[PDB]
Design an enzyme around this catalytic site. Structure first.
Site, PDB file in Angstrom:
ATOM      1  NE  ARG A  49      -3.332   2.560   2.764  1.00  0.00           N
ATOM      2  CZ  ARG A  49      -2.942   3.287   3.685  1.00  0.00           C
ATOM      3  NH1 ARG A  49      -2.060   3.127   4.653  1.00  0.00           N
ATOM      4  NH2 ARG A  49      -3.546   4.251   4.025  1.00  0.00           N
ATOM      5  NE  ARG A  90      -5.002  19.909   6.784  1.00  0.00           N
ATOM      6  CZ  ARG A  90      -4.659  18.934   7.339  1.00  0.00           C
ATOM      7  NH1 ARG A  90      -5.249  17.759   6.392  1.00  0.00           N
ATOM      8  NH2 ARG A  90      -4.087  18.431   8.372  1.00  0.00           N
ATOM      9  CE  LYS A 238      -8.793   5.540   2.810  1.00  0.00           C
ATOM     10  NZ  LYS A 238      -7.502   6.342   3.001  1.00  0.00           N
ATOM     11  CB  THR A 296      -7.421   2.812  10.311  1.00  0.00           C
ATOM     12  OG1 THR A 296      -8.678   2.569  10.909  1.00  0.00           O
ATOM     13  CG2 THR A 296      -7.283   3.194   9.065  1.00  0.00           C
TER      14      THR A 296
HETATM   15  K   LIG Z   1      -5.218   8.335   2.881  1.00  0.00           K
END
Ligand SMILES: [K+]
Ligand SMILES: O=S(=O)(O)c1ccc(/N=N/c2ccc(/N=N/c3c(O)c(S(=O)(=O)O)cc4cc(S(=O)(=O)O)ccc34)c(S(=O)(=O)O)c2)cc1
Ligand SMILES: O=S(=O)(O)c1ccc(/N=N/c2ccc(/N=N/c3c(O)c(S(=O)(=O)O)cc4cc(S(=O)(=O)O)ccc34)c(S(=O)(=O)O)c2)cc1
Ligand SMILES: O=S(=O)(O)c1ccc(/N=N/c2ccc(/N=N/c3c(O)c(S(=O)(=O)O)cc4cc(S(=O)(=O)O)ccc34)c(S(=O)(=O)O)c2)cc1
Ligand SMILES: O=S(=O)(O)c1ccc(/N=N/c2ccc(/N=N/c3c(O)c(S(=O)(=O)O)cc4cc(S(=O)(=O)O)ccc34)c(S(=O)(=O)O)c2)cc1
Ligand SMILES: O=S(=O)(O)c1ccc(/N=N\c2ccc(/N=N/c3c(O)c(S(=O)(=O)O)cc4cc(S(=O)(=O)O)ccc34)c(S(=O)(=O)O)c2)cc1
Ligand SMILES: O=C1c2ccccc2C(=O)c2c(Nc3ccccc3)cc(S(=O)(=O)O)cc21
Ligand SMILES: [K+]
Ligand SMILES: [K+]
Ligand SMILES: [K+]
Ligand SMILES: [K+]
Ligand SMILES: [K+]
Ligand SMILES: [K+]
Ligand SMILES: [K+]
Lengths: 494, 493, 398, 400
Positions: A49, A90, A238, A296
């Site tokens: 990855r 952000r 994702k 994760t």
């Molecule tokens: K990422």
């Protein structure tokens, strides 16, 4: 049943002679070198990855070249995945490079570009231009991995929101902001994504781990960004927020697979609900017959410690019990201290979990959900896996050029290894995210088109023998499926 | 199936109006006061655990007195559990209270009592007298919660073993030792246990958590130690080593329940196998219809932090998915900084997990394992739970004096709450370790013997109404179960 | 399965100790006398049939009086049935039918065999003809033509039961389609939980011969295999030369077929057709029959006053005898067209109302011991079901 | 279930376009001629039975010759059966002479009379010799001994005939009905042909119509699961040879519309022991595929007819088309329900080792009969015996 299977188990019995689950490793400073990658492959890495949140196109070029060299030196096929950075919300910058936020205080978040480089504790910038249109009074704004929580009170104007600080935290420059319970309408792919995806197609990456997918439409955008020359590259979506969880049915239907990004989901959704979300997404992929990655926060403490916590071990184990195809390692391999060990231990956990896993429950549950009459493809594959159980066959051989029927057979979960024989090397790589499958490359250029199919069937059986799955006398279920012609043989091994 | 159930789920739909799993809290300096205990009860404590490894009888008497007082004020029934210290293998003492062990060095472990107080890094004492008899060359000895690992090389004599120090760790006075893969033949109960169990009987504890249970004969020893006066006290056996796992079937038959001590198991058995061992022990208890506790290392980081790790949360949720009746808190409530918060969050995890759990899979698996012909008790209870699913009943009312039939019904896992109506207050307390059951005390001395059973049925249905389980028009499966039995599918008025 | 049950059978084994199927006999010159009826009852007659196509009211009054006397002398209850003459457009009941049905109500008949029923609206015509005084008399509809077969669902829904008249049906419908029609009507009555009678052309050649043809024997057996509650004899007992012998022989064919019959196939087939959520009544009875199989109980005891729940239990087909304890004699007689049930009369005026239900349950268990179904150590499934109050016990026999 | 299937039935609906059950006819004075034989064939005769209790070798030779000529003229394959006289020892002296005569003339099957034990099956086998290896032995069960030793008898034989009339002599009629259920079901599990014989439509020997009881008798034979139904005096010395066979076919077709095949399938599948050997697994899997894809036809490539009988055992709800390179297999399969045979001439067309041509011939036949059309599914199956390593192939084929 799983419960009845648990009664017959012994933790002192030898483990299964094969590991079904697949391990995805993130390549970084710890593991980029050819030698380090060879250690990873032998430890159990199936997929390499690349985290495109960091590093130039030249850093990831090194990874690509080294992965290919390492795999070729060991005579194996390793998949290369491009994990996009994706769109981001952000904050702006602060005077003195810092802002101290105190509980009870009032502040103003603005989308006016003027405040991008002069933000204070009283007023600062957030780059998501549609913020005011999406957020209503009562909603929450999360800042700095969700550590700082702001509550929206009212609209000061069209570009500014009055907010209460609910907890004391000090945020520095350009922190990531999350909008829980809000429909974020950022574009599917960022400007950086379109450049990186173009590079991916050029270098011939096998799959895309597309970040922050929220709807079915956005899957089409990622497809279009790859274009006609990238039509064969898999798109793994994702799931990072409530939108992806809500729109999952259509997302799965348009994607080639799903990644349950627990960490990203945990920032907006309570941890106990993410556990259940993992159950939901994995089972839906199982029924769909598309790969699913548990990602994760897997063995995170093993980044700097020689062994993980007992809770981390059970987490990995239960990801397998849930029915995940793949388990992922991020910083444990990217910048970790024990990269070989963490992969070796992860493989050990998966192998241990598979021994406790009653494969028949999966097979039986998935077969029960099929609508009668079934189509040819579905009936052939479920029947073939049924024959494995009914004859106690020790291997399966699947002839599949694109890997379509290989994934279809793997869906039904036999209690024996599946050997896919294919004429395309890309199929060998892409199947590395499908559980219980191993690939044999049949070089049609050097060995003919094998239209009679006997040579590929022999190549599959040969592999099964060499790996010790079958011996003389054992059964092996052979299956072909491409007006859709098909074939099923229960072979007696010579 | 569970897989099919998973597809229909939504993490945004309201959670169940009920929590089946039961929470056990260890009482210590953080939680011993009457006020703190009321906090715990309101947060979701069903069982108070006393860790007899630490503290005097005066200390645990305070716990007993404060628990009963707290419960009396909130008008609830709380179970009291005595967790024994148990037999132990420890090292002796060291000159200067210290022994620094370096990797690759040679040392000598002896069972010579004269070395108990004057041990050094080169030679020291271990109190297990049969050590030489049980351990052979090649075997390992763990010291200080498995941190120090020694490999046995040869018998120096009939009391001393030559050992290689395989890793660097400094050990202080009287550290605990483990013998992985070795049959420890220590007695079932120690000198302290014998005194402590007698205290438990005299103070009228409801259940015993018996430590380090290795065989079925040892359950009988704890049984004999409690005596005739304590014949109604439940013995929950704590599985801690390989012997407990290997002998599990005979232990379960002899015990009243099981605790899966993951942390203790983890010292001698690889973590991944402990995960599988947890599945085995829980399912075996589920089939036997006896309470099973998932204990140790539950939400450990929340002792000193306001929230736990994501992995810790999934551990608690999966304990429920495994099919545990109970989840246990140790140091988190005993000496923790957030005792109310951790009990509340554990309740939240349990309630969330329950919402995702398919009880029918549990029901169907256990029913399939029954030998035909079934006896009356098994047939009545399985048939009663089956009636719930077939009529979509919203509650169950079980008349059970000892709790026996209450535990048998819960075994079959209905998808609705169970309300047990009992004439014993001790049954109310002891049912606190059985999932999905709530107890209503019926005072036979105050309200009559009720041989018609109608007043007890009414009391149970009234409770189910007050909690919002059933309303007018809903079905409620009423069951009373030698061997007299009765099943009614009641329509709520 | 039935196929699996067939494998384990042996024709040399001792036969079952109980007969489930029920026999109905037509009364004529050969069997009208008190002594002759005593012969029929002992040969295995549960129901006496009066054919109102022939004979006057005084002829049938003798039949009624003699049936009651023969039954009382033997200490048993016998059902009396009135089979109408009857009249495609024609009305339901004829002028003669209305006159005959009034006579039936007055003389307290248990059931009506309503001839030539073609629609559900015609079932209501028989209802009105019986009047308010005959509301508790069961109407068994006779299917005689294609119209009856066509409207069978609505007819079953309105009727109290069905009779399959093969002879009548066979006039307009090919014999091979009548066999299938029989399968259809019997199965629909099983799902409905209402009695079904297999009538006409049963053992016809035994009217004048000492024994029937083999083909006729298999016809009686396959009727039981179809799942019929009742087998019926017409001229065999009415004008026949061997009345006692034909009833004894039919009883033997039923007993033999039952031994070969797998009841569990029936139980599982009917349970699978139940729409979930089930209602209390349906769930109680099916669960009780299920408990019989799961504990290998040797008898059931049902407390039912009207005979409703006694029929509902019998529907689900346990592999043991059912004993119904009732407070009313008419229920005893009416349940004589329901398979696998035996009735025990409980005199409420002579033994109290028994609201505790212990005495009725004890009498039920007592009957099961005297008949030798259960002994000390056996299991017995007790069920009461009248906002619908219900109860189920798995009892250990003392 | 059968009960659930009954509910959905209507007697006024059209019947099935195919008949599974098979009819065997006894040849006598009424039916020996070529013309009367052709009538029997078109009425639904699959097997011609010779009763060797009467007539000389010349008489049965005329039967043999005429049967073949009638069949050859109509372009169909008809099985020729030899029903022995019988006697005690298994075969008589006359039986041994007759059995040798049958081998020479090339009969397809023997209806061996008065079989009482398994040992007796080998005696019939010996009396046929090396040249009579390929001839099926169907054992006639006529008394209590045959019923008692049925398991060992079925194991040794190639099939069973339930002789109700003969059994009725010493066994009560009600027990013969039960005995019929037992033997038929036991043959179904074993996958060997079973014949319901004697007292079928007997009154129709001299009457133009049979009794209604006789009609239900024929139907229930099919409901029990009989492969075959047999006619004796009705076609031998009867007044209505063509009518009785036509009416028997009408009853058999009617019962088939009412019969639920899935019940048979599930019952036999449930009785299978795990693990299964490859050939048994392939065959039940192929039939299961029929139900799950709603396939309209099966095609079995079987030269010996073994896998055809094995596939038929599991009772699919569609026709079975067997493609064989042997004409004797075509004839012998005439006693197996739900199977039709296509002769593939290997001498004329080739050996077709790749199997592509035989599959095509099988599908073509299914199309010509109207069993399948473009868009339908057809389950193609091949399964050899253990001796050939269970060589097998299954295809779910979309018809073009
Ligand atoms: K990422
Ligand atoms: O000035 S004055 O003279 O008036 C004066 C004023 C206050 C005074 N406070 N005295 C104490 C005594 C004990 C004590 N807790 N001790 C223990 C403990 O804390 C823990 S642990 O750390 O939670 O695991 C584990 C223990 C295991 C054992 S053992 O296994 O049975 O040996 C025994 C004890 C403890 C505490 S405190 O609650 O810790 O503060 C305070 C004394 C004198
Ligand atoms: O994963 S979980 O743990 O949650 C879990 C959830 C559900 C579970 N349920 N599994 C079952 C069991 C039985 C069953 N029905 N079988 C029969 C049937 O269906 C029919 S019918 O005619 O076609 O209606 C006729 C039958 C005749 C007989 S016989 O007379 O004895 O031969 C015997 C059986 C059946 C079905 S299902 O209804 O077929 O789907 C499903 C198991 C586990
Ligand atoms: O009348 S006929 O003769 O023609 C006839 C027609 C149909 C017949 N079919 N009968 C059946 C059908 C299914 C069946 N499945 N059991 C299940 C099971 O075993 C498992 S597990 O994984 O192994 O634990 C998980 C399941 C999950 C679900 S679901 O996901 O909730 O739907 C549902 C079921 C099961 C069974 S049986 O229980 O095995 O006996 C019997 C029988 C006879
Ligand atoms: O000229 S030379 O003298 O050199 C010469 C050269 C070769 C020769 N070989 N000729 C043969 C012999 C057997 C044979 N297959 N037979 C069987 C069979 O086919 C099947 S199946 O069910 O249909 O699969 C089931 C069987 C079950 C049994 S049993 O149950 O154990 O009794 C026994 C046999 C078979 C074949 S074939 O080609 O495979 O048809 C060809 C002979 C002479
Ligand atoms: O969580 S994260 O782990 O992602 C994380 C996030 C923020 C972090 N904060 N500051 C950092 C940290 C590292 C860092 N780059 N280190 C690099 C490196 O060590 C190696 S090497 O292989 O070991 O020699 C090759 C590199 C090739 C390129 S490229 O030429 O652009 O490709 C770029 C960088 C590195 C940079 S910087 O801005 O790049 O200078 C800034 C640190 C880690
Ligand atoms: O099924 C067969 C069989 C079954 C039971 C007993 C014996 C035989 C048998 O002998 C035989 C056969 N023999 C043969 C043929 C020609 C020459 C010599 C011998 C040829 C074939 S074929 O299907 O391959 O033509 C099938 C069989
Ligand atoms: K991200
Ligand atoms: K301990
Ligand atoms: K639930
Ligand atoms: K009439
Ligand atoms: K029976
Ligand atoms: K004969
Ligand atoms: K059909």
């Amino acid at each position: 049943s799983q419960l009845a299977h648990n009664l017959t188990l012994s933790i002192f019995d030898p483990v299964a002679n094969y590991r079904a689950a697949r391990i995805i490793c993130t390549i970084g400073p710890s593991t980029q070198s050819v030698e380090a990658l060879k250690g990873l492959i032998q430890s159990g890495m199936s997929v390499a990855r690349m985290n495109f949140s960091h590093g130039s196109h030249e850093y990831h070029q090194t990874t690509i070249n080294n992965v290919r060299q390492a795999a070729a030196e060991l005579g194996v096929n390793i998949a290369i995945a491009l994990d996009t950075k994706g769109p981001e919300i952000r904050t702006g910058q602060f005077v003195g490079g810092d802002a101290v936020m105190e509980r009870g205080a009032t502040c103003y978040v603005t989308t006016d570009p003027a405040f991008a480089d002069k933000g204070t504790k009283d007023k600062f910038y957030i780059d998501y231009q549609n913020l005011s249109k999406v957020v209503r009074p009562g909603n929450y704004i999360y800042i700095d991995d969700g550590i700082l929580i702001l509550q929206v009170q009212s609209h000061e104007d069209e570009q500014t929101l009055e907010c209460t600080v609910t907890n004391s935290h000090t945020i520095s420059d350009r922190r990531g902001v999350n909008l829980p319970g809000c429909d974020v309408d950022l574009p599917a792919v960022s400007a950086k994504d379109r450049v990186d995806l173009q590079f991916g197609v050029e270098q011939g990456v096998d799959m895309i781990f597309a970040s922050f997918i929220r709807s079915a439409e956005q899957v089409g955008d990622v497809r279009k960004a790859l274009g006609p020359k990238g039509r064969d590259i898999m798109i793994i979506c994702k799931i990072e927020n409530h939108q992806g969880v809500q729109n999952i049915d259509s997302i799965i239907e348009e994607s080639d697979g799903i990644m349950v990004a627990r960490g990203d989901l945990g920032v907006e959704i309570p941890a106990e609900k993410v556990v259940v979300a993992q159950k939901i997404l994995i089972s839906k992929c199982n029924v769909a017959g598309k790969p699913v990655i548990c990602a994760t926060q897997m063995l995170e403490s093993m980044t700097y410690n020689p062994r993980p916590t007992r809770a981390e071990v059970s987490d990995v184990a239960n990801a397998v019990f849930n029915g995940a195809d793949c388990v992922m390692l991020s910083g444990e391999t990217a910048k970790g201290k024990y990269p070989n060990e963490v992969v070796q231990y992860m493989a050990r956990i998966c192998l241990e979990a598979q021994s406790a896993l009653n494969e028949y429950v999966f097979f039986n549950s998935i077969k029960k959900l099929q609508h009668i009459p079934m189509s040819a493809d579905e009936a052939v594959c479920s029947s073939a896996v049924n024959s494995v159980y009914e004859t106690k066959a020790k291997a399966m051989v699947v002839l599949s050029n694109t890997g379509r029927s290989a994934r279809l057979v793997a869906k039904y979960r036999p209690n024996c290894p599946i050997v896919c024989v294919t004429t395309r090397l890309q199929t060998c790589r892409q199947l590395n995210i499908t559980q219980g499958v191993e690939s044999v490359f049949f070089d049609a250029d050097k060995l003919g088109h094998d239209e009679g199919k006997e040579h590929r069937v022999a190549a599959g059986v040969e592999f099964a023998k060499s790996k010790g799955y079958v011996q003389t006398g054992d059964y092996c279920v052979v299956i072909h499926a491409d007006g859709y012609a098909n074939q099923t043989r229960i072979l007696l091994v010579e």
